[PDB]
Amino acid sequence: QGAASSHKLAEANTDFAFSLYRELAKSSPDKNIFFSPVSISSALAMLSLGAKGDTHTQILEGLGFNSEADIHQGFQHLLQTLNRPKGLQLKTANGLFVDKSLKLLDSFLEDSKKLYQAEAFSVDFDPEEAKKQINDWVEKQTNGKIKDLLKDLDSDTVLVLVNAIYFKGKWKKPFDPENTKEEDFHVDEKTTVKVPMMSQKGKFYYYHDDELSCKVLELPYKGNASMLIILPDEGGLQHLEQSLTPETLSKWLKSLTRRSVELYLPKFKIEGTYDLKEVLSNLGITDLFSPGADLSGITEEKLYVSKAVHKAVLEVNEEGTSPPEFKADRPFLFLIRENKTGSILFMGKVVNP
């Protein structure tokens, strides 16, 4: 239909981010969430290079696109824009591991390299030595921050998708460590957890959303990205999540004003690990992850995605470079977005810091 616009990309991806948050939140409640919805969108987009028929349809439509949409040069442009050196410098592992007895079409290897900067490997799939080789590659690609990604590996495995990312960003406005004090984080009515509370009093873009009974605060990162922290009022989190949509976000963006805030933010490390087959099953991307998948653009041989893992890790600390109180001493949501593109890089929920 002609390559889709950057604006189409920004809209399809952002609706995919939120819909994916909403499924994760419904699936595993009361657990820490952290994923990179743009990493996932890109990996599915990459795989769609080699998908045909309903397999191809289910991917695009699940990504937020018309069935006949042409998305590749748009994704290519978006990615090179995120990966600019004035960016976050996210080192990420994105690998495709396929049975070595299968001959891969050249058009796929070239097109996934150039467009998506994604690496494909033909591999012998002995359950043990293969998991070693793959986990070791992710380790290298992520500078050792993500070890042992794969837990186990079935002998009849034909195709493994691996998507891993570790993020530790630098604040535009850094907390002074001297202000950091142990405080109670109230996980729920009956659970308390002791946490280093970072504190800072300054000017931040802030909004108190009465409609949704939550506060919203923006923390700028070094590298033209920002964390939007959403703190619900007492006993409101679930309703806040139900009302968590692209239209709410933009409403929040127009509504933030630069205000003097007293800010209390815990230093924390969270993690998400996801099986893309069960996570995407409700988003309607099913055929791809089962024996009758049409991946005849990848190989003429019968083929499907046997295993697909996304893992994302986030460290938050103090480094480095009437008034309202924003005290995050109970579960809260956040997302990290790219300023230039509006891209939702990460989304998360801190329940157990």
Residue numbers in the entry: -4 to 316, 330 to 361
Quoted from the paper:
Hypothesizing that a serpin reflecting a highly conserved sequence may offer insight into the delicate balance between folding and function, we designed conserpin (consensus serpin). To design conserpin we used the consensus approach and a previously reported MSA of 219 serpin sequences. Conserpin (396 aa) shares the highest similarity with α1-AT (137 residue differences; 62% sequence identity). Characterization of its function, structure and folding reveal a serpin that is inhibitory, folds reversibly, is thermostable and resistant to polymerisation.
The crystal structure of conserpin, confirms that it adopts the archetypal native serpin fold. Comparison of native and latent state conserpin structures with available native, latent and cleaved structures of α1-AT545556, plasminogen activator inhibitor 1 (PAI-1), α1-antichymotrypsin (ACH), neuroserpin, antithrombin and the thermostable serpins, thermopin63 and tengpin reveal that despite having the highest thermostability, native conserpin has the fewest H-bonds and salt bridges. Further, native state conserpin has the largest accessible surface area and largest solvent inaccessible cavity volume of all assessed serpins. The D-helix of conserpin is shortened by the deletion of five residues, four at the N-terminus (L84, E86, I87 and P88 in α1-AT) and one at the C-terminus (Q109 in α1-AT). The rigidity of hD in conserpin is probably due to a salt bridge between Q105R79 of hD and E376346 and interactions of the N-terminus with hD. Four residues of the extension were resolved in the crystal structure and a single H-bond is observed between the backbone of residue A-1conserpin and the N-terminus of hD (D65conserpin). The breach region, consisting of a highly conserved electrostatic network between residues E342α1-AT, K290α1-AT and D341α1-AT at the top of the A-sheet is important for controlling the conformational change that drives protease inhibition. This network is significantly extended in conserpin, compared to α1-AT. Specifically, the mutations of T339E310 and S292K264 contribute to a salt bridge network spanning s3A, s5A and s6A with K191163. Conserpin contains three mutations in this region; Y187A159 and G115A88, which allow s2A to more tightly pack against hF, and Y160W132, which further improves the packing density. Although native conserpin features fewer overall number of polar contacts compared to other metastable serpins, new, specific interactions stabilise a rigidified native state that is less frustrated than α1-AT.
